Amino acid sequence: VTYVPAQEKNFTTAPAICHDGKAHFPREGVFVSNGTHWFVTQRNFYEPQIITTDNTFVSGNCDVVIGIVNNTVYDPLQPELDS
């Protein structure tokens, strides 16, 4: 019993996402885009999610990694401090 993927679809990638001046790296999965917003899905399947601090890992600055892009990283603690 084997697991074979079938149909493919081409998306836009990036190694890192720059937010506050520090580079973010994916903990699990890859960075994809539909042409408007950057989505975080896993490697073997397409399940797009919002960019979170639990799914991403932060090290270094943004002047190192070639191909880094700028987007916002959603923090769930920030609406909890404002409510």
Binding site: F25, P26, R43, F57, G60, V65, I66, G67
Partner: peptide, 20 residues
């Protein structure tokens, strides 16, 4: 550049080592 980010994760090496 994304292939060595995959293949370092099988032997226990994070993506900090590749991109710097």
């Amino acid at each position: 550049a994304m292939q060595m980010a995959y293949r370092f994760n099988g032997i226990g090496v994070t993506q900090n080592v590749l991109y710097e």
